[PDB]
Amino acid sequence: CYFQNCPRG
């Protein structure tokens, strides 16, 4: 996940 919103799963 880079430079964007993402779940941390």
Added chain:
Amino acid sequence: IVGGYTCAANSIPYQVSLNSGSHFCGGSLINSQWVVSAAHCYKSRIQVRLGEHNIDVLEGNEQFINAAKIITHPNFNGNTLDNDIMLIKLSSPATLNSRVATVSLPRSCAAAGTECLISGWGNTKSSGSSYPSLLQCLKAPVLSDSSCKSSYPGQITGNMICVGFLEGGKDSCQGDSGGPVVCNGQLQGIVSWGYGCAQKNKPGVYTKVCNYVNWIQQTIAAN
């Protein structure tokens, strides 16, 4: 966990690893038969691993129990991650000992500034990746609701809290989801999402557990 440290051997006995071929999410033991995690960590097949320190080596304190019941919050929204909480009932009770213990549910919500302990086997790099075999730890403060919203305009619901540093550098990351955020021995948050990892002005966003105590107790009592 980026910018954290290796946790002391079994100093986080309530931490669990959700496995389905390999570690994919964290979770926490709230009683002998139930685990709390993130709803986005849902999978139809889940093996819960307790008493884990080094997830790549059988140390002798591990208990591997299959999940029997997997219940995501009925109002979970996959697009906004609102209500990102899930309950798992183990197929058999966990044996509580020195390396496997339960964590208490919150009696009240945590105030801004409260220092908490975040843990997980997630990515430790902000760029690229590096997954540790040993559980990582991070101490971080609960941020004011104001700060949280200004960091994520129009994306923060009343069921989310920010924990971390505006300066960046220290944060949870992919692989930590479902993991616990413990403040003064109480589970106040669950690793949910964020913009990248450890980026400035972009602290981690966590499920506000204190808003779900009723739901958790009722769900446990009913199943």
